[PDB]
Amino acid sequence: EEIVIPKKKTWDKVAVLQALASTVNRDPTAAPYVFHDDPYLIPTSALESRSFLLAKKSGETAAKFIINSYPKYFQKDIAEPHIPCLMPEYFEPQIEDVSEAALEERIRLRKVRASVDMFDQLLQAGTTVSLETTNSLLDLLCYYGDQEPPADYP
Amino acid sequence: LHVDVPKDVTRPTITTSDEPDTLYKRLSILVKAHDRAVLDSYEYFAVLAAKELGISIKVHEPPRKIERFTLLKSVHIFKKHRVQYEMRTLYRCLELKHLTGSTASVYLEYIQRNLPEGVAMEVTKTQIQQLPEHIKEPMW
Amino acid sequence: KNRAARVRVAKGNKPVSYEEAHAPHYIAHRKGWLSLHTGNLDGEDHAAERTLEDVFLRKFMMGTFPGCLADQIVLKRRANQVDICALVLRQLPAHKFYFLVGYSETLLSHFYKCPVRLHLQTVPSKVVYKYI
Amino acid sequence: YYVDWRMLRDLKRRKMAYEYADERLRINSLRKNTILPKDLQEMAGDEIAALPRDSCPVRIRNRCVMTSRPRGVKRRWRLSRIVFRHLADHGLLSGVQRAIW
Amino acid sequence: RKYLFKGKRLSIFADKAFADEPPEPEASPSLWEIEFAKQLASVADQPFENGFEEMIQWTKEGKLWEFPVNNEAGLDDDGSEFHEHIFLDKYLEDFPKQGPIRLFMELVTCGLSKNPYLSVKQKVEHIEWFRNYFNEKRDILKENNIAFT
Amino acid sequence: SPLSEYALRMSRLSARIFGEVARSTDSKSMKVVSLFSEQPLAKKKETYDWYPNHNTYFALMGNLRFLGLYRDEHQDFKDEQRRLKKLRGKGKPRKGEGKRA
Amino acid sequence: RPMRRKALPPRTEKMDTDQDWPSVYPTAAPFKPSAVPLPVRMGYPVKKGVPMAKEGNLELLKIPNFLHLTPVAIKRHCAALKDFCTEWPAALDSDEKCEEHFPVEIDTADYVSSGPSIRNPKARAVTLRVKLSSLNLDNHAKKKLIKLVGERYCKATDVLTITTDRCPLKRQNYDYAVYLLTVLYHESWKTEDWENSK
Numbered sequence: 003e004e005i006v007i008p009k010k011k012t013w014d015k016v017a018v019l020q021a022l023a024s025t026v027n028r029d030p031t032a033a034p035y036v037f038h039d040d041p042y043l044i045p046t047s048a049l050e051s052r053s054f055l056l057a058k059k060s061g062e063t064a065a066k067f068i069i070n071s072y073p074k075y076f077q078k079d080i081a082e083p084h085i086p087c088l089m090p091e092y093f094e095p096q097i098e099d100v101s102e103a104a105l106e107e108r109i110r111l112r113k114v115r116a117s118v119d120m121f122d123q124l125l126q127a128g129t130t131v132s133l134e135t136t137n138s139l140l141d142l143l144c145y146y147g148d149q150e151p152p153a154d155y156p
Numbered sequence: 157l158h159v160d161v162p163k164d165v166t167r168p169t170i171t172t173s174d175e176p177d178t179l180y181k182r183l184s185i186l187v188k189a190h191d192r193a194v195l196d197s198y199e200y201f202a203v204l205a206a207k208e209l210g211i212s213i214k215v216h217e218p219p220r221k222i223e224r225f226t227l228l229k230s231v232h233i234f235k236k237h238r239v240q241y242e243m244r245t246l247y248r249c250l251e252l253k254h255l256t257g258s259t260a261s262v263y264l265e266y267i268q269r270n271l272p273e274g275v276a277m278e279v280t281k282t283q284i285q286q287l288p289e290h291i292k293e294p295m296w
Numbered sequence: 297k298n299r300a301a302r303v304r305v306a307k308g309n310k311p312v313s314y315e316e317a318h319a320p321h322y323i324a325h326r327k328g329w330l331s332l333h334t335g336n337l338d339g340e341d342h343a344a345e346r347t348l349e350d351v352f353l354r355k356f357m358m359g360t361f362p363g364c365l366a367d368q369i370v371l372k373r374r375a376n377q378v379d380i381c382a383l384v385l386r387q388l389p390a391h392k393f394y395f396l397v398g399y400s401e402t403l404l405s406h407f408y409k410c411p412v413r414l415h416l417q418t419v420p421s422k423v424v425y426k427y428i
Numbered sequence: 429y430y431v432d433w434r435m436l437r438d439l440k441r442r443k444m445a446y447e448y449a450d451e452r453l454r455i456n457s458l459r460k461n462t463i464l465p466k467d468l469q470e471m472a473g474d475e476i477a478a479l480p481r482d483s484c485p486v487r488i489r490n491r492c493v494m495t496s497r498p499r500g501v502k503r504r505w506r507l508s509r510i511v512f513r514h515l516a517d518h519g520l521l522s523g524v525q526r527a528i529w
Numbered sequence: 530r531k532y533l534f535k536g537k538r539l540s541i542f543a544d545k546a547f548a549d550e551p552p553e554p555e556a557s558p559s560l561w562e563i564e565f566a567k568q569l570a571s572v573a574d575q576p577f578e579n580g581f582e583e584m585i586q587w588t589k590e591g592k593l594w595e596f597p598v599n600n601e602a603g604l605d606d607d608g609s610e611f612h613e614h615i616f617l618d619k620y621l622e623d624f625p626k627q628g629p630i631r632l633f634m635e636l637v638t639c640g641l642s643k644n645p646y647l648s649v650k651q652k653v654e655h656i657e658w659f660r661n662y663f664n665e666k667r668d669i670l671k672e673n674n675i676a677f678t
Numbered sequence: 679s680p681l682s683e684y685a686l687r688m689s690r691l692s693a694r695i696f697g698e699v700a701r702s703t704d705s706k707s708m709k710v711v712s713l714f715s716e717q718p719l720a721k722k723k724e725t726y727d728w729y730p731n732h733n734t735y736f737a738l739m740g741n742l743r744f745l746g747l748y749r750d751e752h753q754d755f756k757d758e759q760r761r762l763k764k765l766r767g768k769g770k771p772r773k774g775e776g777k778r779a
Numbered sequence: 780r781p782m783r784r785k786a787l788p789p790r791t792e793k794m795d796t797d798q799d800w801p802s803v804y805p806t807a808a809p810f811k812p813s814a815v816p817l818p819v820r821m822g823y824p825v826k827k828g829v830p831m832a833k834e835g836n837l838e839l840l841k842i843p844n845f846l847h848l849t850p851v852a853i854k855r856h857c858a859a860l861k862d863f864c865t866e867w868p869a870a871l872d873s874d875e876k877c878e879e880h881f882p883v884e885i886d887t888a889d890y891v892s893s894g895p896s897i898r899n900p901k902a903r904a905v906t907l908r909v910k911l912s913s914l915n916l917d918n919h920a921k922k923k924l925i926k927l928v929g930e931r932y933c934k935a936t937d938v939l940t941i942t943t944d945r946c947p948l949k950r951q952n953y954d955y956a957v958y959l960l961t962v963l964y965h966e967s968w969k970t971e972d973w974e975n976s977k
């Protein structure tokens with residue numbers, strides 16, 4: 003008499019899109035999806051292909067520069083659920099006091115010269131520094147070889 | 157592609173759990189739009205998709221709603237001269253029946269992701285479950 | 297006489313587009329809507345916020361592509377995605393368009409916290425519906 | 429820059445009413461009943477009066493967000509009749525058409 | 530002849546009867562391990578091939594809504610329960626057990642139970658406010674024959 | 679008709695189950711339940727966020743005009759009317775040095 | 780001296796009439812006159828004129844096209860999506876059969892709209908519907924259950940409807956409605972001394 007209820011299948015949030023993607027194949031008469039679908043904007047040569055994908059990246063970098071330099075204009079969040087990847091980034095330490103904790107922040111932000119200055123200052127005062135924290139400093143310095151992380155800016 | 161074809165396309169992983177599945181006796185999908193033709197095309201897409209997955213579907217058109225309001229035409233004075241505006245809302249109801257919870261999620265995802273611009277959905281799931289174990293037996 | 301959104305008659309030498317030719321009373325009859333969202337449907341909220349975003353998005357696109365827009369843009373919202381469909385004249389070099397798309401997309405995606413895509417159809421010149 | 433100084437004053441009135449909402453709710457509850465001694469109710473009537481005048485939520489006026497017009501506004505869009513008509517008559521509002529019937 | 534898996538081997542190592550004995554996160558991910566993982570990702574980093582792959586990436590990053598739509602996605606009110614929101618008389622123990630203050634606080638806690646726009650923490654703050662308010666007004670209440678705390 | 683004991687005691691048994699007011703409360707005293715069951719007018723997103731942040735748009739677009747990524751036809755128009763006006767000698771006086779001393 | 784770039788010929792010219800159209804429009808996109816191999820025209824025509832052509836046609840761009848959704852695509856899509864679906868129990872072949880084994884009906888509503896926020900206030904509400912015949916109720920209990928619930932009970936259908944929206948979330952309102960049923964059922968069976976005075 004008792005009805006048998008089927009056992010519910012489960013899948014990832016992107017599983018349905020992955021299933022639909024499997025059906026379609028590449029369009030032979032179209033340029034790669036990155037390139038804009040227009041006759042005027044289709045890359046004729048291999049140089050225009052790379053140059054079109056270098057002007058697009060440049061425009062993205064121009065926007066990320068503005069967002070990260072004038073963050074007060076990009077702080078109102080109207081997106082529910084909240085989107086972390088569409089918020090301004092902050093890379094400069096905001097902990098002013100000179101403590102082992104402040105050094106840990108600089109190490110997390112991966113600043114090499116600033117962390118060395120605060121580590122030396124901590125040694126000058128003589129305040130205790132954890133061996134694990136001292137290792138996180140060496141990791142950053144050893145990995146970047148004493149040079150600030152490579153970045154591009156004005 | 158004429159000669160160049162994928163060989164063994166990768167397919168998402170669907171793992172059957174040990175939890176029992178939801179049982180929806182009914183599932184009403186009320187789509188709304190300003191355009192009837194969009195509702196006709198979406199109705200065709202949704203009814204075809206239901207029939208292809210084995211779902212039982214019926215469709216009816218709830219009466220349309222028209223909201224009208226009046227405004228002052230001139231910027232200054234000339235009260236008697238007005239302009240009227242309206243927004244028309246059209247409805248298409250897709251009544252599904254006898255759906256498990258796995259069938260209702262995949263179907264709703266597929267049709268919600270393809271919901272045209274200017275169209276709003278109002279799903280109304282109706283689940284059926286047994287009685288609470290406490291209620292089953294009277295206890296003093 | 298009604299002066300609203302009517303491109304008045306000149307002397308047969310003014311090239312008006314299809315959108316400009318038709319007065320307000322032809323909306324939903326001969327010409328559609330430039331923006332399509334769900335915020336003016338019955339029992340739906342956030343009409344005020346969707347409309348304000350549209351006003352800005354049109355002023356942004358005009359300034360970002362100055363003199364390169366052949367017609368008004370079309371805004372299409374689906375879920376949280378925003379899609380901007382603009383007819384643009386072929387004045388600027390091709391690589392410059394890739395820059396303004398990458399810039400205008402990223403900037404408006406971090407400003408309204410939604411995925412924003414720009415769709416550009418390039419015309420050789422403005423399309424003339426009739427000479428009025 | 430906001431449209432005018434009148435819109436700026438209203439914006440401040442809206443941000444100070446939000447700050448004092450819980451306070452004015454908790455205190456005003458003591459007055460809108462017949463269960464508490466009238467001595468307490470008369471005193472709560474004075475604590476609410478002492479709060480800043482811009483906290484009072486009846487001093488907020490709905491103005492057009494784009495022109496700061498005090499009257500003629502439609503609450504669903506927050507625009508005046510003149511501004512609403514310009515966007516509507518150009519096909520820029522989604523689903524708004526002229527009413528012929 | 531040149532069989533890939535038939536022939537002599539170095540034999541310096543032995544068959545791994547024990548495998549992966551130390552856990553993969555022996556320590557918190559170091560900069561060296563965190564950066565090597567980023568480089569492995571770039572190895573398979575190709576541009577989007579269609580609109581599906583773009584939407585898949587947005588979904589993995591949280592940019593695009595998940596489907597089917599859940600209007601309460603990521604919206605948990607401190608993992609509370611229905612009984613926590615509705616039964617709030619546990620917090621009225623400090624107040625007088627009877628009298629006008631009890632009659633008033635009953636109306637306050639009845640409304641708070643019917644409030645869907647507040648969390649339990651916020652509702653408690655409303656109750657706590659009145660506890661401190663009546664304590665301050667102890668002298669006026671005593672004149673009216675009401676004894677508080 | 680009047681409510682007999684059975685009717686009244688059943689009504690109280692129901693209110694206790696459904697979390698309703700159980701005692702006899704005057705219409706005046708029922709406002710306390712309303713105040714604490716409803717979001718206040720000043721706490722609703724429509725009121726406190728009635729306006730768009732006009733400072734963010736004006737400041738952001740002004741900054742973009744100076745970076746060369748945005749073109750403001752209106753501002754360029756005003757910039758040239760000021761330039762021409764200054765040449766004509768009708769420019770803005772310096773503060774504290776107005777016509778009246 | 781300045782060189783103006785030349786647009787390529789539309790790629791529709793290279794499209795065969797037996798192509799795999801789903802690949803051309805895999806997902807929802809705007810109408811691209813250079814990718815749709817159709818001589819479509821749209822626009823009210825001027826006197827002694829034909830409707831405007833597809834290239835540079837704002838009206839076609841304003842349409843929410845269904846090119847990505849074609850009968851060939853929809854059938855190919857659903858073939859992949861079949862693995863996700865689960866089979867309805869065959870025994871529950873009728874509505875009455877479901878009421879026998881599953882008397883409780885829980886109503887939950889979702890809303891899909893366009894905007895940055897996925898939040899709708901109406902999604903929290905839940906509604907429980909049970910028939911009193913399905914519940915094991917003595918003659919005394921059924922009379923007590925019907926008096927307590929008031930207008931929630933409908934004599935014509937014999938259905939008790941409990942609507943719970945007071946709690947913030949849907950999982951809280953759902954658990955509350957199940958709770959309300961348990962207390963009403965258990966209380967109805969309990970007999971109080973004051974009940975003998977009816």
Ligand SMILES: [Mg+2]
Nearest residue numbers: 486487488489
């Ligand atoms: Mg007023």
